[PDB]
Amino acid sequence: WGFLSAVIAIGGMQLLATMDSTVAIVALPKIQDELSLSDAGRSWVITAYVLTFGGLMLLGGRLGDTIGRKRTFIVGVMLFTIASVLCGIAWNETTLVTARLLQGVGAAIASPTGLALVATTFPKGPARNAATAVFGAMTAIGSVMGLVVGGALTEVSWRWAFLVNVPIGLVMVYLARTALQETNRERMKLDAAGALLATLACTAAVFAFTQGPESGWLAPITLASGAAALVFGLAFLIAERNAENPVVPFALFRERNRVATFAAIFLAGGVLFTLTVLIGLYVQDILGYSALRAGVGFIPFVIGMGIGLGAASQLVRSIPPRVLVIAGGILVLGAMIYGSTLHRGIPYFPNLVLPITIGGIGIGTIVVPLTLSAIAGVNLDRIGPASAIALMLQNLGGPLVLAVIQAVITSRTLFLGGTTGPVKAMNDEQIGALDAAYTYGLLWVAAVAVLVGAAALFIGYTSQQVAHAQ
Template sequence: MRTDPLPGTGSGAAGPPAGRDSSHRSLALAAMLFAVSMTFIDQTIVAVAAPRIIDELGLSSSGMQWVVNAYLLALAAFFALGGRLSDIFGHRRVMVIGTLLFVISSVLCGCVPRGDFAQTWLIIFRALQGLGAALMFPAALAVVIAVFPVGKRGRALALFFGVSGALTAVGPLLGGWLMVWTWRAIFWVNVPIAVIALVLAAMAHIPESRRRERLDVPGAVLVAAGMGLSVLGFQQASAWGWSSVATWACIVGGLVVLAVFCRYELGVAEPLIKLGVFRDRAFTVDMLVLFFAMLAFVPVFFFASVYAQISLSASPNQAALYLLYFFIGFGIASQWGGRILDRRGARPAMKLGTALGAVGFALWANKLTHLSMHDQWPYAALAGAGIGFLLAPASTDAVNRSIGASYGEVTGLTQTVRNYAASIGIAVFGTILTHVTTDKVVDTLRSDGVPAGAAHDAARSVAEAVTGNPDAQRPTGTGHVATLMRDSMDAVRLDFAEANQWVFYGMAIALAVAFLCAHRHPGTRVTQDTPPPTPASSAQDVRGG
């Protein structure tokens, strides 16, 4: 097995090849930002167009949910594979392949024909979008890491994560604007973005490097099956119910497959993921901090948006602007976090970020029942700042400690952990929100004189709004019961806000746990003059056994 470092890493390596000037680095960073921006925007943009797609193509609500989930499932299942392919075949090459697969799939999603095959068509090409993103993202991140020396890497990755993460909030806003023309444009918009990314990548003259190793096909199949099954179980828990045999069969079955995968990898000479990296305590702490932080970071986009539309009666575009409070804090703090990483290492940034995040989410939760955006923005910004401080330092520190400079492999691993945590967060918090909302709305409507049956139906409608239909909470019809329900909507909005408090307090607890994990970080700083203390120091550790 090859264990010599790639350019810019390993013992005594100070950065990318000589002659790599700052303008080429900037072009490479810009190219990677344009490429990954598509993956972040697509996580939220489809949800805005879902009602229009359902109406025009005649899809069922469950079918539309599969259209959304197909992307996320493929993303989670193939991230580790994407990172490994990036190492073996070259970061630039795999980024280009992933970008082309993503944009071609996007075009075909927008060209979906009407008729019985529409749902299957969308699910297939949304899954291929997810596969393209899984190839593209770890390769793009590896390119940024490879072209920037360790001493400048923190700021570069802070910009990478800050800008690309903020683009998630652009999805709903951009989707609302594009739908004035046609909902199909939410997929076609990826074409000009991909062209810009590919042109900039060509101009940057990104150096290519490869690891001469075989692809661990059995490992790739096991990790894809394990991640796919368990994520499917978490995603479908709200539809199947937590008491469903199918839910737990997927979750437990997926975890068992992942356990088999780990055992298999320890005995393979050239594994998909070298698990020996977890022997570095700092790397393990980085992964734990990312896991617990991601329980809040990705789900907050979804729950804050739905809260704004239901409790604050905001439009989708106004809900997107509401999320900008969070991203203002996130964007500013991500730059500071990168500077702290470069000067003092990851531990101070992670401790500060997790502490601010825990406090910010708790204070934000306390203000949700005020039903005023104006009262909430400082706490939303504080919560965003907490995530901004920790995200790039934890991710960068983990990659700096990678075995044998396996950038793609470890970026794939970190992104797999992040997506897995996000799926769990959405499922668990979604279940909490649904149950608490249903109980509170039923009590409110019955106290206002609404019959039990109608109260339960209305409560379910509000709860179903959590799955992406913000109009579901608005009762329609005529007569005494409909009038009673419409008169109760102010109280129902407050009920939904109180239910969301449980979710946001849960996010605060997740960040508090991440804070405790950050304290376990050894605090050693990876610099240009100090090679990362990874298990790559011995061939035995590189094999993970």
């Protein structure tokens, strides 16, 4: 009976974690029209979120056994809700930026603790797989609902588009306070000496990654940011190798299977984020369907992820995870093969819905065992850092591959013929070249997914080890 009141309560962080991002991406032009904001305005609006989501990632993950688990999650969602309502009640660029900074801080405090909590509770067995499936369906539902809300409630006012978090956040705090088990008495202080350095290094890395595409990688600013990040990481390792409670322990890095799983998660998250960004741009640019109907169109994506997620969570206990990841990669590869023959003006069904739902099934079947094996029954002192590492890699993989994939797409557009700019660009004869470039980039994404599968083949974890009982 309480299984639901636990699973939605724990996993609902991803709801806001994706809803806020999608809604902001949708409502950037409305906010620019409303408040006296330039392109750098919305640029820093999103930059604040990414900085406070990346920099506080490691410290947020380590913020356990010091403040607690349930209290950490509750303060995270409280900060998220307060920052969102401050975004709703805004009158200047500075207050909006401060609200976004607080939002990112709260999200970074809460999100790693989500995986830490779903690992601490539901020790091992059917509960863990069902909870991971709930996690995947949760992030999918959050994404689609964010798209729908951004499409629908934008013509009225963006204030509601940012305010919609407060009801969802409030009901989430209701379930979290009511139906989240209090942690046992286990207190342990953390050494901030390495923690501050790691936070600064992650902040510099996210700074460089965000400022790269804004003005190119050739500018000295991004090179200086990357150099600062590298020296900060070097100092962090130097001062952390002999730390009693390191932010990122090396104990999890002494097993080949764990390194393989982390590399697979990094590459798979990158390929997934690139895939969804590409499909979103394709739907919102060439097909011409606005977000109000784009949400309905992407509903089958969520249905496919749900069915594939349930299937994978059911059959993990009997089939090894490596072949499951390989089969999910094959299904996603087939989805890309089917979608490679896409042009403007194609019939809605079954030309488009079938590849989307196939991709959803594949994404679910690959995201069950990867996040099931990232938390592979480590000792409770490192489970938090392990979840923080998993989320950090999942977020970091995305832009790393998306930058090069979009560079390839733009190069193909230039070579075949086209212009980079606003909607409809140059004369309409280049839209076909743009679809060809998008399909070529899709094939490159498929090659990256092939690399993902090859790397995940190295995962030597057996199904009976981390999945079934212990």
